[PDB]
JSON list of C-alpha atoms in Angstrom, two decimals:
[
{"chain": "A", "resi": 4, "resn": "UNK", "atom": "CA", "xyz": [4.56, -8.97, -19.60]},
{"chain": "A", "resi": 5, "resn": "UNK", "atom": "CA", "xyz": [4.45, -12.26, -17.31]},
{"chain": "A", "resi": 6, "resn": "UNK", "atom": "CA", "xyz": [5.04, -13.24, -13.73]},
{"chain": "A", "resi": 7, "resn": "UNK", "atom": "CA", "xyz": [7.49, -15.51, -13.22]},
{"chain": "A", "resi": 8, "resn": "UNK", "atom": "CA", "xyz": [6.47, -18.80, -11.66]},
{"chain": "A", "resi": 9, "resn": "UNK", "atom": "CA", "xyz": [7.98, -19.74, -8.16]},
{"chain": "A", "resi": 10, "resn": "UNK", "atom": "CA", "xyz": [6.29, -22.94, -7.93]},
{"chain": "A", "resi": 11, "resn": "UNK", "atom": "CA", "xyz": [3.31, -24.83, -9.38]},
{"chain": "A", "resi": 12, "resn": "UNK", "atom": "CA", "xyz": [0.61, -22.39, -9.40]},
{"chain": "A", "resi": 13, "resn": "UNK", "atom": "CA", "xyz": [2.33, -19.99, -7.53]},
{"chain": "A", "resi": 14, "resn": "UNK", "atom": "CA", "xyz": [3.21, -17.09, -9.20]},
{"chain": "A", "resi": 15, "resn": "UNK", "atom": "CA", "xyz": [5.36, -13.29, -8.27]},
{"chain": "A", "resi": 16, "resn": "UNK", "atom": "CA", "xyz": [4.78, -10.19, -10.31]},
{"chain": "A", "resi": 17, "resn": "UNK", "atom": "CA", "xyz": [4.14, -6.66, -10.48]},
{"chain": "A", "resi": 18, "resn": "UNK", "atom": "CA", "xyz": [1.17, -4.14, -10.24]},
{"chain": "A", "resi": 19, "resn": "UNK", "atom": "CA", "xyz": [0.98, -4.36, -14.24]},
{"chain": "A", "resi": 20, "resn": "UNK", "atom": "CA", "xyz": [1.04, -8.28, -14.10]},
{"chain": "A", "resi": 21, "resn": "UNK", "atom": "CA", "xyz": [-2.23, -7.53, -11.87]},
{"chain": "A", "resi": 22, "resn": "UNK", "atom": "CA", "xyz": [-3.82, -5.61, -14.35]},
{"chain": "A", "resi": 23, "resn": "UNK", "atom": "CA", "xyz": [-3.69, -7.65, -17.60]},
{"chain": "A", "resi": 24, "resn": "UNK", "atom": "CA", "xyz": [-6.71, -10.08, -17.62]},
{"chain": "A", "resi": 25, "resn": "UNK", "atom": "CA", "xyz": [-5.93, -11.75, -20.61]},
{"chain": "A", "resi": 26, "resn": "UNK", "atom": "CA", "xyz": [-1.90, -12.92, -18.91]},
{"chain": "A", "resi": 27, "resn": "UNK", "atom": "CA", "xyz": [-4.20, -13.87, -15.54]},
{"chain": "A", "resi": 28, "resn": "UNK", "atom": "CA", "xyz": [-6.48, -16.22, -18.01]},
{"chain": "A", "resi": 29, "resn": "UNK", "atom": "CA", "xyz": [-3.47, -17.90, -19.95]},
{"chain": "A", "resi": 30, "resn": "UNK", "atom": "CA", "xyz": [-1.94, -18.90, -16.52]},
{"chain": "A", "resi": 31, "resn": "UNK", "atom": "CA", "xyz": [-4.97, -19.96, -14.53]},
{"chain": "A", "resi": 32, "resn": "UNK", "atom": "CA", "xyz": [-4.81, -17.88, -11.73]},
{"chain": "A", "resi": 33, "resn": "UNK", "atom": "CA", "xyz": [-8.63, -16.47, -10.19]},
{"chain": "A", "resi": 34, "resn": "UNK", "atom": "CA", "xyz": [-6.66, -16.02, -7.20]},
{"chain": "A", "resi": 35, "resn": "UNK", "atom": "CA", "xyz": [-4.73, -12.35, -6.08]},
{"chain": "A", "resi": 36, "resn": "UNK", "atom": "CA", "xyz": [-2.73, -11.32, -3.13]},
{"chain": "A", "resi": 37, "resn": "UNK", "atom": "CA", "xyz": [-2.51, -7.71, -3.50]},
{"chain": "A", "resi": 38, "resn": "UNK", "atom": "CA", "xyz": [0.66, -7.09, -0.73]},
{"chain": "A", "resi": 39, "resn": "UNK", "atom": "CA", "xyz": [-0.13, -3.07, -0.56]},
{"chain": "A", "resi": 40, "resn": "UNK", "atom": "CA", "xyz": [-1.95, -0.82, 1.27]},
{"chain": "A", "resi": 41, "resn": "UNK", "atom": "CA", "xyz": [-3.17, 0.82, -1.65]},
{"chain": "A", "resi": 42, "resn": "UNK", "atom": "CA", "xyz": [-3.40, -0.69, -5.38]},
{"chain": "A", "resi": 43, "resn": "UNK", "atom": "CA", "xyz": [-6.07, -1.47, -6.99]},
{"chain": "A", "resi": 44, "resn": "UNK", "atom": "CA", "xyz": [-8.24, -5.31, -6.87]},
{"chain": "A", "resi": 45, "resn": "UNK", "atom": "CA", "xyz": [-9.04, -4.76, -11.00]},
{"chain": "A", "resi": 46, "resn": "UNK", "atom": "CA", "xyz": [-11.72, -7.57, -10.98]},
{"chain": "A", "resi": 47, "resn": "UNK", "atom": "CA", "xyz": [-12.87, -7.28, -6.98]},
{"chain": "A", "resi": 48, "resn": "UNK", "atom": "CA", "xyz": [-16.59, -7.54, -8.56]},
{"chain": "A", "resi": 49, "resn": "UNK", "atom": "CA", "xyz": [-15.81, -10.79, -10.76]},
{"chain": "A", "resi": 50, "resn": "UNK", "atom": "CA", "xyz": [-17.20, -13.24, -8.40]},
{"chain": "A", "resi": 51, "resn": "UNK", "atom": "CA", "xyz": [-14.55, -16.00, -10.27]},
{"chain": "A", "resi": 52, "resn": "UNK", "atom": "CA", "xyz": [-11.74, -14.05, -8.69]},
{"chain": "A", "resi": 53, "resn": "UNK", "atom": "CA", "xyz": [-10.53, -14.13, -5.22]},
{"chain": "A", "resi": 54, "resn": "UNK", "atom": "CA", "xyz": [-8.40, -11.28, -3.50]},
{"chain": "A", "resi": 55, "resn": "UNK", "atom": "CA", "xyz": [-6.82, -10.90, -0.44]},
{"chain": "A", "resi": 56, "resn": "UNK", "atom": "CA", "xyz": [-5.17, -7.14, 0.33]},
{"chain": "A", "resi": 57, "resn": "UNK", "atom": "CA", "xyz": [-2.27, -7.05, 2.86]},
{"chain": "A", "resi": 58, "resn": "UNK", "atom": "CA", "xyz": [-1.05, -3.65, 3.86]},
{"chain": "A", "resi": 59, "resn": "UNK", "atom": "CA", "xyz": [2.71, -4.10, 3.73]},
{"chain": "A", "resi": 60, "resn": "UNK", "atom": "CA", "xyz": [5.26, -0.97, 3.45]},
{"chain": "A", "resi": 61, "resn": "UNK", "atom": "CA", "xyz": [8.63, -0.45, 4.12]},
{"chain": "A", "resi": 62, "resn": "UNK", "atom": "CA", "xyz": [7.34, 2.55, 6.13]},
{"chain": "A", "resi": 63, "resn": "UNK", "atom": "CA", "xyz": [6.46, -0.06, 8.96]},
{"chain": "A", "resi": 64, "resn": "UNK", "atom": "CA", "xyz": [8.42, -3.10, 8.31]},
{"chain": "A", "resi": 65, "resn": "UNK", "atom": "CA", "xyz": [8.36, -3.96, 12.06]},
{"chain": "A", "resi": 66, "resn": "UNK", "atom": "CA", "xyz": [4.72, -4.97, 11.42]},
{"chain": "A", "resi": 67, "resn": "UNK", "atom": "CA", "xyz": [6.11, -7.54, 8.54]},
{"chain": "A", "resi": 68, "resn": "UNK", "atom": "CA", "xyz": [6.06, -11.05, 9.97]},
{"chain": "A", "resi": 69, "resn": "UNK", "atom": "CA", "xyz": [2.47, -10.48, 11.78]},
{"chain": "A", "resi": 70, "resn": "UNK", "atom": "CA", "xyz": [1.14, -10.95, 8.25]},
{"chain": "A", "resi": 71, "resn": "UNK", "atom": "CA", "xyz": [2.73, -13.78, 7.09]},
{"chain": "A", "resi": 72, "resn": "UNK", "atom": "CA", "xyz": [0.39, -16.41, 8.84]},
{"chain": "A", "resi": 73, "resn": "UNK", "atom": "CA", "xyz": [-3.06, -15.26, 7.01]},
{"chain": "A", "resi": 74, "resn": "UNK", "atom": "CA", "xyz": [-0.98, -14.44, 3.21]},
{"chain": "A", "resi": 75, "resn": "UNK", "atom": "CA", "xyz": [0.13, -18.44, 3.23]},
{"chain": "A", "resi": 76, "resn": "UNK", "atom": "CA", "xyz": [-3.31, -19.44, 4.42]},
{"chain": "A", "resi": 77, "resn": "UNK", "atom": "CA", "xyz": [-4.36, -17.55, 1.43]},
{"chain": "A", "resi": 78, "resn": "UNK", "atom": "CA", "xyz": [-2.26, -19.02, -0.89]},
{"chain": "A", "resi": 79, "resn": "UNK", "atom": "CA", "xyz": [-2.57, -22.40, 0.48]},
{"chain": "A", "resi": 80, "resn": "UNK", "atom": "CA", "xyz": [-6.41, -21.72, -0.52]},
{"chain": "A", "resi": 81, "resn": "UNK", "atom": "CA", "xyz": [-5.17, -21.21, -3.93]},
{"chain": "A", "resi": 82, "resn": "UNK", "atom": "CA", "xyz": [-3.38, -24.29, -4.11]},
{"chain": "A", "resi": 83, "resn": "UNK", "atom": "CA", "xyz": [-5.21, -26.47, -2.76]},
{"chain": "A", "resi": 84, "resn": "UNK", "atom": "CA", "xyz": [-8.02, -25.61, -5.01]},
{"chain": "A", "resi": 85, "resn": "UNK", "atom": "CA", "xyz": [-5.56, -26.37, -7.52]},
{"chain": "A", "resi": 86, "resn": "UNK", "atom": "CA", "xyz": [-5.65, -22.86, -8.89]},
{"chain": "A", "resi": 87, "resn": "UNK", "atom": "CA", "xyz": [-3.26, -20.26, -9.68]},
{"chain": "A", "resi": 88, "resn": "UNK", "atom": "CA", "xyz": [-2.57, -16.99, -7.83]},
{"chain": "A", "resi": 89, "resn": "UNK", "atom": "CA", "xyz": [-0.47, -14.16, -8.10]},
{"chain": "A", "resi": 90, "resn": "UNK", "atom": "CA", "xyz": [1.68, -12.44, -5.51]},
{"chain": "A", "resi": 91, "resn": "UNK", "atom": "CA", "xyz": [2.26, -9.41, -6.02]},
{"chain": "A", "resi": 92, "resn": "UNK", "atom": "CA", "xyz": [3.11, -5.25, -4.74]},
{"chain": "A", "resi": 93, "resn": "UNK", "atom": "CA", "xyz": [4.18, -1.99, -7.04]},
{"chain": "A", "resi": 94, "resn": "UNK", "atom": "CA", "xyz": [7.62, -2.97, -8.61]},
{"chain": "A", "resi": 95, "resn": "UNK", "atom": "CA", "xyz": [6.77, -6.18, -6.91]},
{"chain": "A", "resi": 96, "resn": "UNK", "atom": "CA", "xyz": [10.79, -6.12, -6.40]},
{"chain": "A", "resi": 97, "resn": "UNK", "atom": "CA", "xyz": [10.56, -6.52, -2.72]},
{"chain": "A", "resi": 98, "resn": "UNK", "atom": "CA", "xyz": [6.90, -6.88, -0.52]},
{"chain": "A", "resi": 99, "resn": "UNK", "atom": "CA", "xyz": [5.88, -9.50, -2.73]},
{"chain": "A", "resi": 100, "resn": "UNK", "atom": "CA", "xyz": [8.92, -11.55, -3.22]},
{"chain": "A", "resi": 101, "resn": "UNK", "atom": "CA", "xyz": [9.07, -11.23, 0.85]},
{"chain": "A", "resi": 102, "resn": "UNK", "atom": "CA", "xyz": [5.57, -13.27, 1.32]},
{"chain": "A", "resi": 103, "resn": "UNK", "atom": "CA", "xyz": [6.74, -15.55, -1.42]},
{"chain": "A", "resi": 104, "resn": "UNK", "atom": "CA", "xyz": [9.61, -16.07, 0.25]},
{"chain": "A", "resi": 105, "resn": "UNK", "atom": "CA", "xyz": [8.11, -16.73, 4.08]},
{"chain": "A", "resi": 106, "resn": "UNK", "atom": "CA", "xyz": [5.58, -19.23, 2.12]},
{"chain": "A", "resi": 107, "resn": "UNK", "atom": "CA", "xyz": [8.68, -21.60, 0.73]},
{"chain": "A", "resi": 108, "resn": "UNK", "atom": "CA", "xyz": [10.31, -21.45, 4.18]},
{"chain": "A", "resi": 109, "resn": "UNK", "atom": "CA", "xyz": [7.33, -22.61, 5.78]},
{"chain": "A", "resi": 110, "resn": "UNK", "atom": "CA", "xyz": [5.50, -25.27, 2.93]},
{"chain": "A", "resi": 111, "resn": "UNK", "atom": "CA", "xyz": [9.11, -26.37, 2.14]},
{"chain": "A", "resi": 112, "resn": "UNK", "atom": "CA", "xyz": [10.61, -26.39, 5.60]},
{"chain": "A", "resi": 113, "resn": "UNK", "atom": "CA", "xyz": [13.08, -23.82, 4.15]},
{"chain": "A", "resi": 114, "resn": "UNK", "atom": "CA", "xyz": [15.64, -21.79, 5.91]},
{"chain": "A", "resi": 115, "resn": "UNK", "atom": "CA", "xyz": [15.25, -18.17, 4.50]},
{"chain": "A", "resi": 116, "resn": "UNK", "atom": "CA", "xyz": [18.59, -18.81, 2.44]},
{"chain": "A", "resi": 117, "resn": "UNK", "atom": "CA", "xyz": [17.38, -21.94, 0.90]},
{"chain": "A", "resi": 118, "resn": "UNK", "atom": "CA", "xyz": [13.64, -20.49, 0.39]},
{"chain": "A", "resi": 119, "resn": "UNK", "atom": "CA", "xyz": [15.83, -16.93, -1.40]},
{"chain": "A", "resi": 120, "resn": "UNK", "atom": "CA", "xyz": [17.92, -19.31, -3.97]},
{"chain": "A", "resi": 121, "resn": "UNK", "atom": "CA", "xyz": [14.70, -20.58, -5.21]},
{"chain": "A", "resi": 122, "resn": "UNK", "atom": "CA", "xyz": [13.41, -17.55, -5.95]},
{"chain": "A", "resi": 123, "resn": "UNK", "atom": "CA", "xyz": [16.65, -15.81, -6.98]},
{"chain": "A", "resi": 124, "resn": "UNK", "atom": "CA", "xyz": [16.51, -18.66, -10.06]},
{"chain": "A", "resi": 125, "resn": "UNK", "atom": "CA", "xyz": [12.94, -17.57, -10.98]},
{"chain": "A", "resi": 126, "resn": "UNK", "atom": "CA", "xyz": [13.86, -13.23, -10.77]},
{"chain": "A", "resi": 127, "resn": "UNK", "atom": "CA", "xyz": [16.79, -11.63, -11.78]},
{"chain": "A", "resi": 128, "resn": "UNK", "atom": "CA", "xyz": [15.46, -8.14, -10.19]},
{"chain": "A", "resi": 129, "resn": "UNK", "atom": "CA", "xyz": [15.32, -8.48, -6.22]},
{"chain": "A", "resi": 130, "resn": "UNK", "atom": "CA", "xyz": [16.05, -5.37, -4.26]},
{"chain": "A", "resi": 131, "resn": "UNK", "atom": "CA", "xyz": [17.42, -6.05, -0.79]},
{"chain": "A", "resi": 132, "resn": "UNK", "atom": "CA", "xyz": [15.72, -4.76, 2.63]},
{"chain": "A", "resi": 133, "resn": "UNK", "atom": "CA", "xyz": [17.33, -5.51, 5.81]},
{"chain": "A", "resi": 134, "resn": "UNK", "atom": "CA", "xyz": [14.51, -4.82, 7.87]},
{"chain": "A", "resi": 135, "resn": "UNK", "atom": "CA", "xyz": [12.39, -7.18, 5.68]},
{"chain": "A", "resi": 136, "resn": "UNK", "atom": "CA", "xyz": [15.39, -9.83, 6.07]},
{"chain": "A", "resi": 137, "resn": "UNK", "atom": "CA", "xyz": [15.15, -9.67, 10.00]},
{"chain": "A", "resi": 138, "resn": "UNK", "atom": "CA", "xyz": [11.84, -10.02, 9.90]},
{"chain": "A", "resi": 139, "resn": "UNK", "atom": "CA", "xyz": [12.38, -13.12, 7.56]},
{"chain": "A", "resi": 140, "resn": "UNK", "atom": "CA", "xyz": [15.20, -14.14, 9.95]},
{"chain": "A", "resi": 141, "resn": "UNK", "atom": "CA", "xyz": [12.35, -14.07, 12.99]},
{"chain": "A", "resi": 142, "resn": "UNK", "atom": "CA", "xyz": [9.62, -16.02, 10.98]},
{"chain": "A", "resi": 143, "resn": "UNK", "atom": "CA", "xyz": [12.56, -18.70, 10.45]},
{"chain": "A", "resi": 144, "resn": "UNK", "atom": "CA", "xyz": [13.01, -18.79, 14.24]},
{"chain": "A", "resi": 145, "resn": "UNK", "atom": "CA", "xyz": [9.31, -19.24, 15.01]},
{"chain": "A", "resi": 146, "resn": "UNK", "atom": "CA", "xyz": [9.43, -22.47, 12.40]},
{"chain": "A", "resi": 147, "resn": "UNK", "atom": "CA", "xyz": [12.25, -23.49, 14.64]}
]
């Protein structure tokens, strides 16, 4: 129906929330961070839209953290131009609210607690992954 916003411009939401044109024009978002290996970039040939694909999967969530660096660039991009994008994965219960999460920790010099609350406030459906939550815990050691 409508991904919830995390923080200006910055939004989380599911596969459907990537689909629907018309809730991607009412927000202002041209920009997309698909966080799967394999959905879908609906509007890839609409030069107005930007995507970024980032093959994430609990199948290898060692890899996790090694992503994190060039999904904030991307959404800085967003940003920064003052446009919306949307994060988002299948469910989009756990990949995407992952990268959201690293992206507050690091733009908000958040520890990974701090950086979760916000988003906890925002989505009422988060499904916990331990491995995900080390690699979170790692990314917050690299910030310091």
């Amino acid at each position: 129906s409508f991904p919830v916003q995390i923080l200006p411009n910055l939004y989380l939401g599911s596969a459907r929330d990537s689909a629907n044109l018309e809730s991607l024009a009412k927000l202002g978002i041209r920009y997309i961070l698909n966080v799967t290996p394999n959905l879908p970039n609906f509007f890839e040939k609409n030069g107005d839209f930007h995507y970024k694909q980032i093959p994430i999967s609990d199948h290898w969530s060692q890899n996790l953290s090694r992503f994190f660096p060039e999904a904030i660039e991307f959404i800085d991009e967003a940003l920064s131009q003052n446009c919306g994008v949307l994060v988002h994965s299948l469910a989009g219960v756990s990949r995407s609210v992952t990268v959201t999460v690293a992206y507050l920790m690091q733009k908000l010099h958040l520890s990974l607690n701090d950086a979760y609350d916000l988003v906890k406030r925002k989505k009422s459906n988060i499904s916990p992954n331990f491995n995900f939550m080390g690699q979170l815990l790692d990314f917050e050691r690299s910030l310091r």
